[PDB]
Structure 1
Amino acid sequence: SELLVNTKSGKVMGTRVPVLSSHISAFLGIPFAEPPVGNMRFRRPEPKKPWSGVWNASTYPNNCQQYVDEQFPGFSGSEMWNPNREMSEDCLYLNIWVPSPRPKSTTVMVWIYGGGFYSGSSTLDVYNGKYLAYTEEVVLVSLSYRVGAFGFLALHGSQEAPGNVGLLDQRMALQWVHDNIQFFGGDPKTVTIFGESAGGASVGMHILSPGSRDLFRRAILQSGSPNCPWASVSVAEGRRRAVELGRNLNCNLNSDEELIHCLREKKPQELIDVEWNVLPFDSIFRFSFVPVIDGEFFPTSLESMLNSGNFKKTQILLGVNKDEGSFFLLYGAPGFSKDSESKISREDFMSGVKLSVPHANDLGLDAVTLQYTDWMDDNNGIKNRDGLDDIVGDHNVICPLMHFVNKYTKFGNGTYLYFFNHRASNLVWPEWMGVIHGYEIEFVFGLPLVKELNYTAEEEALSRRIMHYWATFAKTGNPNEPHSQESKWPLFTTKEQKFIDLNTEPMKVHQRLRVQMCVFWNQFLPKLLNAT
């Protein structure tokens, strides 16, 4: 009765799951799209044709076709990110957690996973929405979208494989929530989208895309933003990559129509096996199939939209972690190791710089080297490691986000900036990697409230603060509660540029987050690469 809901696409039968020492309602694996199989591969999503009967919505769905990481088999630190369900091109489903009893028009939070646009799943243990929905009494949605070539193969001009179809997937899950979340207790006019990494960049792209603005109220961006250097490509580069993929598979390259149907015949993992061979450089923190600046989803360049103010004006709550770069060096760089302190010689440092700014010329790599080398001590293995770490995070995550924060605040109505730098007490990774990319997610989603997972009671409190900041921001557009006595998180302003620390210690206010290095990455280095 509570688990039997009559949507505009059919009836859905949920299930009563346990949370903490209570229960709530879960509606798992509801489809919002026609399965993009067959010659519907690479194509714009089509709305799910409505169904008679009762859709069984009591089990997690499939995960989309993606490259599976086998770097450290059996290791929980890395397997926690892999698909925990079967993979299938039939994967466009969403999950809904409803408090119990079902509320009356309560605040909706829609979660978009990251994973560099090539991986990701809605069904991961650390994206379990029961804790956040129960504690803050919000209705928690998590969607999905096609990743890799299946979601972002771009042959602009063709309508067979136009590009950005994985973003269009996310838009159709937002459109479904707009049309149906009211039947679950959710208020369609108070919906907050939020995601991390490629999901944070996705959030920002819906802020900018005109066809997406009317489908959500406000936005949270965690360690990602639409202007990141790994998040977009030109229609030329995306066409170069798509053609290069057909070459790798012996496809007819005479026309698109011939290329697209050649690729539609291959098995999904046939594409995945050659996915990485299309990248133009040797790189870390670069991914093959990503959104394109097509002129449709994005009417002009991202920067000219941020300049003119051509985007949704609302409130945003965003931030970054302390060591966004570390695990990307673990995986792709010389001298690092999961079971070692990972001191790195000057020769490996200059190699890492090359992998990390793969587009620069020699003048640019010299500039980057100069900015992060302590020439009084240039063979200090620790300083070289920490230095290259900061390079990856600053270039790929922090300084792109900071540039997005400064342009958005000009026209927006409320900006709340955070810096996350608590290292979880139970972390399975070596401590040289500090606060790792993606590792604030377990605090956002309430997992420190489970005694079984062996957090400290101060981490439970930190997790409860974050869940509240997030949910309160989702309801009111402001993460602080009026008339309380907890210290207030200040508005980031164009003039004072304030932000807070998120950790177990009392809240400190700082200003100008990593400004010295982001003037280099956002102002000086682009000028030097454009002039040479």
Structure 2
Amino acid sequence: SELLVNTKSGKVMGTRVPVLSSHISAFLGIPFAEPPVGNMRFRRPEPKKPWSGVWNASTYPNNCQQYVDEQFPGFSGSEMWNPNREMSEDCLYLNIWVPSPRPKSTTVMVWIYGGGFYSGSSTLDVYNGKYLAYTEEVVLVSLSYRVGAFGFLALHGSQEAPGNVGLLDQRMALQWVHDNIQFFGGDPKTVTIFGESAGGASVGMHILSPGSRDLFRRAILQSGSPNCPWASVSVAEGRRRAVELGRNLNCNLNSDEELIHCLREKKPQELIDVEWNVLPFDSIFRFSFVPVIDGEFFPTSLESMLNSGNFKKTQILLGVNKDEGSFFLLYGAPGFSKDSESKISREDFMSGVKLSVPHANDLGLDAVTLQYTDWMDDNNGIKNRDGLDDIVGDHNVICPLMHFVNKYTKFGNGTYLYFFNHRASNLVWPEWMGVIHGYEIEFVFGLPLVKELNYTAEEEALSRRIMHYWATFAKTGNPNEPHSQESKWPLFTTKEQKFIDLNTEPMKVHQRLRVQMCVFWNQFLPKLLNAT
């Protein structure tokens, strides 16, 4: 009864799940699209045909086909991000957590996982929706979308492999929520989309895309924004990378039709095995198959859209972590190790700069080096390590997001900006990595509320504050409860540019997040590269 819901696509039967000494309802693995298999590989998604009978929605679906990390086999800190279910191209499903008893018409939050557009799953332990749904009495949805070449192979001109189909998967799931969430006790007029990393970039891309704007109310972006250097490519570069994928698999490169037909004959893992080979440079924080600026999903360049105010005008809440860069340095740059302090020699520093900014000429690499080198002390392995960490995080995450936040605030209806700088007491990664890319998510999803997970009492309190900010924002457009006597998170404005730290300490308001470095990344360096 409470677990039996009739949707426009057919009936579903959910499951009663325990959560912090209570219970809520979960509907796991609801299909929202036709399986993008066989002749539908690389194609825009199609709506799921209605089914007869009762869909058993008591277990998580399959995860999409993706590269799996084996750098640290069995290590919890990496394995928590890997698919925990069987991989299949039959992967377009969503999950819903509903408070018990069912609300009449409550605020909806829709989670979009990150993972560089090449990886990610709705089913990770860290994305478990039950704590946030129960604690804040929201209807929490997690969608899925095709990643890698399956979601973002782009042969512009072709209707068979147009690009951005992973973004259209997200949209089709949002359309399903719009059509069906009322039957689960959600208000389709009060849907907040939120996501981290490529999920954060995606949230911003739906803000930008006209075809998406009317499918959600407001938006939260975590450590990602649509203008990130890794988050899109031109149609030309998307074409080049698709052809290089064919060449890597002895495909007929004569035409789009022959190349696509060849690529459709391959087992998914044959694509995944060569996926990294199509990148133009040795690089870190760069991903092969990402959204294309196509003229359809994106009418024009992102910069012209941002400048013109051509985007959904609403409220946004967004922010970054203190050490976004460290994970990518561990996995891809010389001298870093998870088992040492990773003091970086000057030689390794210069090597990391070139990997971190692979599109730069030598004059640009000199500019970056000078900006992040203390020439009184250039052989200090700690300053070299932290300098490189800052380079990666500033260029790839923080300054793109600050450029977005400043353009958006000129036209939007309310901006709230945060700086997450809490290092978790039980982190398994070494100290030098700081506050890592991805590690605010466990706080957003309420994991510190689980006593078995061994967070401190102050971390539980921080998680509860963060969940309440996010949910109050979703409900109202403001993370603050006015008439309350808690410290107030101020609006980010064009003039004062305020933001807060998120950590276990009493609130601090600051201004101009990393302004010095972001002037370099957002204004000076692009001018240097456009001149030379």
How high is the TM-score relative to the length of structure 1?
1.00
Distance 1:130 1:405 in 2: 30
Q: SS at 2:110's partner residue? A: strand
**CA shift at 1:438, angstroms?**
0.2
- How far is 1:256 from its partner? 0.4
Aligned-partner Cα distance in 2 for 1:327–1:61: 28
SS in 2 for 1:253: coil
- 1:352 aligns to 2:349 (yes or no): no
The 5-angstrom pairing of residues 264-275 of structure 1 reads 264-275=264-275
CA shift, 1:492, in A, is 0.2
Q: SS of the residue aligned with 1:6?
A: strand
For residues 53-80 of structure 1, what are the alpha-carbon distances to aligned partners after superposition, in whole Å with 9 as ceiling and x for unaligned?
A: 0000000000000000000001000000
Q: What secondary structure does 1:339 align onto?
A: coil
Give the distance between the partners of 1:509 and 1:138, measured in 2 at CA.
28
Q: Deviations over 1:431-474 (max 9, x none)?
A: 11010000000000000000000000000000000000000000
1:293-346 C-alpha deviation (Å, 9 max, x unpaired): 000000000000000000000000000000000010000000000000000100
Ranges in structure 2 where 5+ consecutive residues have no aligned partner: none
1:411 is paired with a residue whose SS is: coil
- Structure 2 distance, partners of 1:457, 1:431, is 21
Taking the aligned partners of 1:389 and 1:255, their CA distance within structure 2 comes to 43
CA distance in 1 between counterparts of 2:72 and 2:322 reads 24
Q: CA deviation at 1:482?
A: 1.1
- Structure 1, residues 113-168: CA drift from partner, whole Å, max 9, x if none? 00000000000000000000000000000000000000000000000000000000
**Structure 1 position 372, deviation (Å):** 0.3
Cα offset, 1:290, TM superposition: 0.1
Shift, 1:182, TM fit = 0.1
Deviation readout 1:465-507 (Å, 9 max, x if unpaired)? 0000000000000000010000100000000000001000000
Alignment partners' CA distance in 1, 2:514 and 2:135: 34
C-alpha offsets along residues 254-279 of structure 1, whole Å, 9 cap, x if unaligned? 00000000000000000000001000
User: Per-residue displacement from partner, 1:168-208 (whole Å, max 9, x unpaired)?
Assistant: 00000000000000000000000000000000000000000
Query: Any idea what SS the aligned residue of 2:111 has?
Result: strand
Distance 1:344 1:424 in 2: 24
Q: How far apart, in 2, do the equivalents of 1:450 and 1:500 lie?
A: 26
For residue 292 of structure 2, give the secondary structure of its aligned residue in structure 1. Answer: coil
Q: Which runs of 5+ in 1 are unaligned?
A: none
Alignment of 1:49-448 (within 5 A): 49-448=49-448
TM-score by length of 2: 1.00
Deviation by residue 1:218-259 (Cα, 9 ceiling, x = unmatched):
000000000000000000000000000000000000000000
> Secondary structure in 1 aligned to 2:233?
coil
Distance in 1 of aligned mates of 2:253 and 2:522: 38
Note the C-alpha offset of 1:371: 0.1
Offset of residue 508 of structure 1 = 0.3
Cα deviations by residue, 1:401-432 (Å, 9 ceiling, x for unpaired): 00000000000000000000000000000011
Matched, 1:36 2:30: no
1:522 maps to what in 2?
Answer: 522
In structure 1, C-alpha distance between the alignment counterparts of 2:202 and 2:177, rounded to whole Å: 17
Question: Within 2, Cα distance between the matches of 1:492 and 1:93?
Answer: 36
Deviation at 1:524, TM superposition (A): 0.2
SS in 2 for 1:317: strand
Distance 1:83 1:150 in 2: 16
User: How many residues are aligned here?
Assistant: 532
Distance in 2, Cα, partners of 1:506 & 1:73: 39
Give the superposition deviation at 1:18: 0.2
Matched with 1:477 is 477
CA RMSD of aligned residues (A): 0.3
Distance 2:327 2:52 in 1: 47
Q: Output the CA distance in 1 between the equivalents of 2:420 and 2:156.
A: 39
Which runs of 4 or more aligned residues in structure 1 lie more than 6 Å from their structure 2 counterparts after TM superposition? none
**CA distance in structure 2 between the partners assigned to 1:181 and 1:204 by the alignment:** 22
For 1:383 and 1:248, the matched residues in 2 are separated by 40
The 2-side partners of 1:327 and 1:151 are apart by 24
Looking at structure 2, the residues matched to 22 and 443 of structure 1 have their Cα atoms a distance apart, in angstroms, of 20
Amino-acid identity (%): 100
Answer yes or no: is 1:462 the counterpart of 2:462. yes
**Secondary structure of the structure 1 residue equivalent to 2:436:** coil
The structural deviation recorded for 1:399 is 0.2
| Aligned equivalents of 1:331, 1:498: Cα separation in 2 | 34
Structure 1 residues 344-400: Cα deviation after superposition (integer angstroms, max 9, x where no partner): 100000000000000000000000000000000000000000000000000000000
CA separation in 1, counterparts of 2:417 and 2:326?
22
Task: State the alpha-carbon separation in 2 of the partners of residues 324 and 344 from structure 1.
Answer: 18
